[PDB]
Design a protein around this motif. Structure first.
Motif, PDB file in Angstrom:
ATOM      1  N   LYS A   1       0.823  -1.204   0.000  1.00 26.57           N
ATOM      2  CA  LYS A   1       0.000   0.000   0.000  1.00 26.57           C
ATOM      3  C   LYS A   1       0.861   1.259   0.000  1.00 26.57           C
TER       4      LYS A   1
ATOM      5  N   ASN B   1       1.360   2.521  -3.301  1.00 24.79           N
ATOM      6  CA  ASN B   1       0.133   2.548  -4.100  1.00 24.79           C
ATOM      7  C   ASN B   1       0.207   1.516  -5.225  1.00 24.79           C
TER       8      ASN B   1
ATOM      9  N   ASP C   1      -7.159   2.422  -6.098  1.00 24.54           N
ATOM     10  CA  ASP C   1      -8.448   2.319  -5.420  1.00 24.54           C
ATOM     11  C   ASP C   1      -9.484   1.635  -6.303  1.00 24.54           C
TER      12      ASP C   1
ATOM     13  N   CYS D   1      -7.208  -7.666   2.790  1.00 26.25           N
ATOM     14  CA  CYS D   1      -6.708  -7.300   4.110  1.00 26.25           C
ATOM     15  C   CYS D   1      -5.189  -7.327   4.200  1.00 26.25           C
TER      16      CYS D   1
ATOM     17  N   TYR E   1      -3.425  -6.139   1.612  1.00 29.47           N
ATOM     18  CA  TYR E   1      -3.093  -4.866   0.977  1.00 29.47           C
ATOM     19  C   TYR E   1      -3.462  -3.679   1.857  1.00 29.47           C
ATOM     20  N   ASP E   2      -4.636  -3.723   2.476  1.00 27.90           N
ATOM     21  CA  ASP E   2      -5.174  -2.575   3.184  1.00 27.90           C
ATOM     22  C   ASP E   2      -5.952  -3.108   4.390  1.00 27.90           C
TER      23      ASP E   2
ATOM     24  N   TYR F   1      -6.369  -1.964   7.434  1.00 25.60           N
ATOM     25  CA  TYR F   1      -7.123  -1.020   8.269  1.00 25.60           C
ATOM     26  C   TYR F   1      -8.268  -0.384   7.474  1.00 25.60           C
ATOM     27  N   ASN F   2      -9.149  -1.255   6.991  1.00 25.15           N
ATOM     28  CA  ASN F   2     -10.269  -0.875   6.136  1.00 25.15           C
ATOM     29  C   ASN F   2     -11.496  -1.593   6.677  1.00 25.15           C
TER      30      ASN F   2
ATOM     31  N   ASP G   1      -1.610   2.268  14.058  1.00 27.13           N
ATOM     32  CA  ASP G   1      -1.963   0.979  13.467  1.00 27.13           C
ATOM     33  C   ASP G   1      -1.867  -0.136  14.496  1.00 27.13           C
TER      34      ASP G   1
END
Ligand code: CLW
Ligand code: CL
Ligand code: CL
Ligand code: MG
Lengths: 142, 128
Positions: A18, A21, A25, A55, A57-58, A60-61, B68
């Motif tokens: 991430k 990038n 998105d 999860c 990759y990202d 905290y989503n 985090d």
């Protein structure tokens, strides 16, 4: 799983996918839709792979976490589901659905006192009236 | 986890945790970071180990990395709002005052820790 991956990433503190990038998105949105396509057809194993991928990759989503927690709850992996629901709530803070589901998981984990605390939080803090009725019906049985 | 196979005795892990806090309390941050990283490799699931590494990251002003870990730490205890308090602090340093306000409000609305709520309220009072 997803949490150990997040913790390893934080320990090693190197560049993540991430951070550069590596996946835009728009592509992440597509993969999420595919994950639910699998899920909605009952292809739970493929959906789980896709939500695990998201999860990684990202992590905290809230949307990715909630998808994966639902899978674990359906698979009766109740501790893993509750852990992810708690992460989702910490990020979201305003939606008490993960707190309700954590309460259900704790009930299955034979932890009625933890479950009671979850359902009481729903009752005292949620503005979702239908969710509050559901939480109360669990509370009445404990 | 290495913890899952009991690769190091419990009392020796207690010793390593206390030594890590000794380094931290003495300002030996680089050494504390090695020791807390060691602990979190050994058992990623131990909330106090994660909180220690998060505190190091916060002291080093790596505020997003700290935040985090605090989110993971919150899930690994479910009921302890201290990681949410520290996240609010990190969010203020990240220039995200609305996110910080949400953290401190969550502490006040859910926590049973009265000293922690006193601290969270003093932050809320200061946020414009
Ligand atoms: O005190 C609390 N807050 C909580 C939030 C979740 Cl998601 C689960 C259990 C909790 O216990
Ligand atoms: Cl995990
Ligand atoms: Cl903000
Ligand atoms: Mg109300």
């Amino acid at each position: 799983g997803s949490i150990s991956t997040a913790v390893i990433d934080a320990i090693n503190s190197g560049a993540t996918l991430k951070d550069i990038n590596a996946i835009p998105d728009d592509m992440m949105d597509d993969i999420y839709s595919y994950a639910y396509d699998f899920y909605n057809k009952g292809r739970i194993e493929e959906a789980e792979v896709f939500f695990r991928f998201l999860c990684i990759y990202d992590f905290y989503n809230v949307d990715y976490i909630m998808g994966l927690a639902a899978i674990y709850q359906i698979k009766e992996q109740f501790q893993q589901a509750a852990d992810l629901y708690a992460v989702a709530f910490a990020l979201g803070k305003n939606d008490y659905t993960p707190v309700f589901h954590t309460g259900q998981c704790q009930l299955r984990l034979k932890a009625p006192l933890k479950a009671k605390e979850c359902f009481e939080l729903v009752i005292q803090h949620s503005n979702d009236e239908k969710l509050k009725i559901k939480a109360q019906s669990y509370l009445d049985a404990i």
